[PDB]
């Protein structure tokens, strides 16, 4: 399909995406904290040697500066790939993201833009990250018209989505599930390829219930589908959302019209989480097809704990138990 592949884990697939970008786009630069030596998760290894210190470089330790700086680069039309070291530390930049980057094109009547900005940041739980190296901030950004928010589930997905973000003419936040950085490898094309934004992927067809998730949680619901099939004889349609905003309403609604049941799951806390937007929209569009209430199996409404992580996360047992009750409603 896409030419020669090689086995890559998720960090390697990110490096590949970035390499392909710098090779084909002479304007492109990569910057942030500790990116020059290869990054704290290895995502930029080799790139400074290959492309030059003016193109892959460290900034001072200042997230609001990193994002404001990126926006400025993008204002001149040059591709700006900013790194925020953990998604938990994106908040100092929230004003630059929400008040500036998202609104730049609209407020100027398209006289100026920062479409060539991409912000990439490690995301999601990691077993022992506690409050500040575990967060999933996507719902915070979902309430901001003018930015795109994109989350891959695998190395092949990560490279194609990140290439799309870098090339998309809108400021994009790309969240990389850090627990996958060195998890299992899969085959990833060496040359550039794109996966479309705002497009969900049905990864397993099913007829009794629709399951929706993104990031690492996709692998959880895939396992839940298997458990449901084996233990309940229930056929689950498993969907990776991929883009948080603008999201693929049509693919989700089509599935729920078919199955009549929907369970959405994410690591982020329940209240104000992105499952709420999907549930309310599906309810509006698929009301007459709903056999049971839409279920949300999410993180609890607490900060993300250190020692209690195994009890906090919406794991396969929590998802399975919710599904069992919904099938029985």
């Amino acid at each position: 399909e896409y030419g020669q592949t090689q086995k890559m884990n998720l960090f390697q697939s990110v490096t590949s995406a970035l390499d392909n970008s710098l090779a084909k786009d002479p304007t492109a630069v990569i910057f942030g904290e500790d990116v020059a030596f290869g990054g704290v998760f290895r995502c930029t290894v080799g790139l400074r040697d290959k492309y030059g210190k003016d193109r892959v470089f460290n900034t001072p330790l200042c997230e609001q500066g990193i994002v404001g700086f990126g926006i400025g680069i993008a204002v001149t039309g040059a591709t700006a790939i900013a790194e925020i070291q953990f998604a938990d530390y994106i908040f100092p930049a929230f004003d630059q993201i929400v008040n500036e980057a998202a609104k730049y094109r609209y407020r100027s009547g398209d006289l100026f833009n920062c479409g060539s900005l991409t912000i990439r940041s490690p995301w999601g739980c990691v077993g022992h990250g506690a409050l500040y190296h575990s967060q999933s901030p996507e719902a915070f950004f979902a309430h901001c018209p003018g930015i795109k928010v994109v989350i891959p589930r695998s190395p092949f997905q990560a490279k194609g989505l990140l290439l799309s973000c870098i090339e998309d003419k809108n400021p994009c936040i790309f969240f990389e599930p850090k627990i996958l950085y060195r998890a299992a490898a899969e085959e990833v094309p060496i040359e550039p390829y794109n996966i479309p934004l705002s497009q969900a992927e049905v990864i397993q067809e099913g007829s009794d219930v629709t399951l929706v998730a993104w990031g690492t949680q996709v692998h959880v619901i895939r396992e839940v589908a298997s458990m449901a099939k084996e233990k309940l004889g229930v056929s689950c349609e498993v969907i990776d959302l991929r883009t948080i905003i603008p999201w693929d309403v049509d693919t989700i609604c089509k599935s729920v019209i078919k199955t009549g049941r929907l369970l959405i799951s994410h690591e982020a806390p329940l209240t104000g989480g992105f499952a709420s937007e999907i549930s309310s929209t599906v309810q509006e569009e698929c009301f007459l097809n709903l056999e049971a209430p839409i279920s949300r199996v999410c993180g609890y409404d607490t900060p993300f704990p250190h020692i209690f992580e195994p009890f906090y996360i919406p794991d396969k047992w929590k998802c399975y138990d919710a599904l069992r009750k919904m099938i029985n409603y």
């Binding site: 304007t27 500066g65 001149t76 398209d110 018209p145 705002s198 603008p246």
Partner: protein, 391 residues
């Protein structure tokens, strides 16, 4: 000899705190006195007559426009306004020292830069009225100007956000071998924001061809500088970031011009940032929501004004007189009123334009919202001010 990587310094064997010099701070660079007389001939830029008349006519035309649009706001003809009274010399002195294609970031008090760059009166007006001629499509509050043709990045209300952006644009310019500078204007209040510390530091460490231009006019809305900082203004901050810094008399167009011209020459040649703090006084209210008499002016307006000072200089050269002054005052009023009248009579943009440019393309779900408004207006349109808007 000390070995620490973090600084280059000798040892000292006695405990001595370093004390800030705030009582006699960084001195204020002046070229002409309050009577328009050149103080030090070696510093005189000897700008040609046509250029100096341009500085003068730019300032006065801005002032004429300010008077009219401030009145328009009071009558509720436009929703909001911010005057430039006292910022005219900082504006036009610095703009005249830039190359035409140097990129400008600012905020609320930089309209003179656009005026110097020959931005049409019609377009200043179109933005304040949000009419069909506004390239900003009526989306932002008045005085949020922008011009891609004149390299003047659209203003936004959140203070200081442009500072680290300007640094990024400067980094990109360096890479592009643009031989271009970026200038970034901001007030002394805005300098308290975290984004000011971000921009100053990045510009130094990333070696960017940028001029930081701080207008220190003594107040941020009601807040006097005594409550804003306790160092020697903003200029004294620059050296702590490794930035070459200077303070100038902001009511002296020539001091402003000289410092900006030299900052621009060195910033581009050396890829290093320069900070200019221009000392002025905000003569007007903060904006149209402000009655400044609540917290504090005639001194500055009659004793030390950029327009009056330049006018005195012009007289000494034989380059202006009372007749020319009268005629220009009349012509400039006529020009502003012609643009004003035309602006008021233009329709506003099609309400459909509320939905475009949120993203470059319009997402299907957004188009769905646009269609819902169209249906809504079909049924309930009598309840909306549709007669004012383009169709």
């Amino acid at each position: 000899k000390p070995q620490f990587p973090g600084a280059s310094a000798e040892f000292i064997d006695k405990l001595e705190f370093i004390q800030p010099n705030v009582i006699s701070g960084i001195p204020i660079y002046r070229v002409m006195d309050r009577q328009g007389q050149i103080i030090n001939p070696s510093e005189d830029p000897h700008l040609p007559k046509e250029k100096v008349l341009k500085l003068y006519k730019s300032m006065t035309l801005l002032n004429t426009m300010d008077r009219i649009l401030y009145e328009s706001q009071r009558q509720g003809r436009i929703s909001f306004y911010m005057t430039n009274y006292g910022e005219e010399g900082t504006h036009v002195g610095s703009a005249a020292a830039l190359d035409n294609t140097d990129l400008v970031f600012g905020q609320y008090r930089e309209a003179g830069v656009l005026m110097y760059r020959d931005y049409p009166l019609e377009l200043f007006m179109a933005q304040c009225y949000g009419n069909i001629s506004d390239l900003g499509k009526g989306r932002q509050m008045p005085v949020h100007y922008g011009c891609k043709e004149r390299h003047f990045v659209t203003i936004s209300s959140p203070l200081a956000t442009q500072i680290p952006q300007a640094v990024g644009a400067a980094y990109a310019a360096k890479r592009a071998n643009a031989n271009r500078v970026v200038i970034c204007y901001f007030g002394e209040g805005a300098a308290s924001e975290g984004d000011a510390h971000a921009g100053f530091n990045f510009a130094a460490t990333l070696e960017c061809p940028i001029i930081f231009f701080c207008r220190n006019n003594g107040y941020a809305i009601s807040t006097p500088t005594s409550e804003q900082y306790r160092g020697d203004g903003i200029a004294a901050r620059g050296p702590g970031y490794g930035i070459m810094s200077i303070r100038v008399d902001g009511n002296d167009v020539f001091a402003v011009y000289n410092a900006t011209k030299e900052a621009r020459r060195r910033a581009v040649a050396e890829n290093q940032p320069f900070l200019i703090e221009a000392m002025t006084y905000r003569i007007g209210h903060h904006d149209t929501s402000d009655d400044s008499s609540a917290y504090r002016v005639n001194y500055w307006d009659k004793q030390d004004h950029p327009i009056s000072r330049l006018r005195h200089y012009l007289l000494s050269q034989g380059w202006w007189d009372e007749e020319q002054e009268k005629a220009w005052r009349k012509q400039s009023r006529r020009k502003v009123m012609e643009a004003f009248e035309q602006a008021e009579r233009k329709p506003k943009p099609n309400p459909n334009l509320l939905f475009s440019d949120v993203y470059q393309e319009m997402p299907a779900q957004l188009r769905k919202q646009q269609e819902s408004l169209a249906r809504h207006l079909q049924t309930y349109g009598e309840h909306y001010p549709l007669d004012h808007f383009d169709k």
